[PDB]
């Protein structure tokens, strides 16, 4: 009951952490595209 409510709360933390992970994967991908763009302008 109190244990169950705490388990649910930790599951919410876990879910919100995955949303943050997915955001950070988007950050990595977008910065890589920007980096490759700059490199394409210099090397080609």
Residue ranges binding its own copies (CB under 8 A): 2-7, 9-14, 16-21, 23-28, 30-35, 37-39, 41-42
**What does 19 interact with, of Na ion, its own copies, none (CB < 5 to 8 A by kind)?**
its own copies
Residue with tokens 């910065």: 31
**Does residue 17 interact with Na ion by CB under 5 A?**
yes
Q: How far is the CB of 16 from its own copies (least distance, A)?
A: 6
Dihedral of CA atoms 28, 15, 10, 7 in degrees, nearest 10, equals -150
Structure-token match 């388990």, residue found = 7
Cα distance between residue 5 and residue 34, in whole Å: 44
Binding site for Na ion (CB under 5 A): 17
């Amino acid at each position: 009951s109190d244990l169950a409510a705490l388990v649910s709360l930790v599951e919410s933390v876990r879910h919100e952490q995955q949303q943050l992970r997915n955001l950070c994967e988007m950050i990595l991908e977008q910065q890589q595209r920007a980096k490759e763009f700059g490199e394409n302008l210099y090397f080609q």
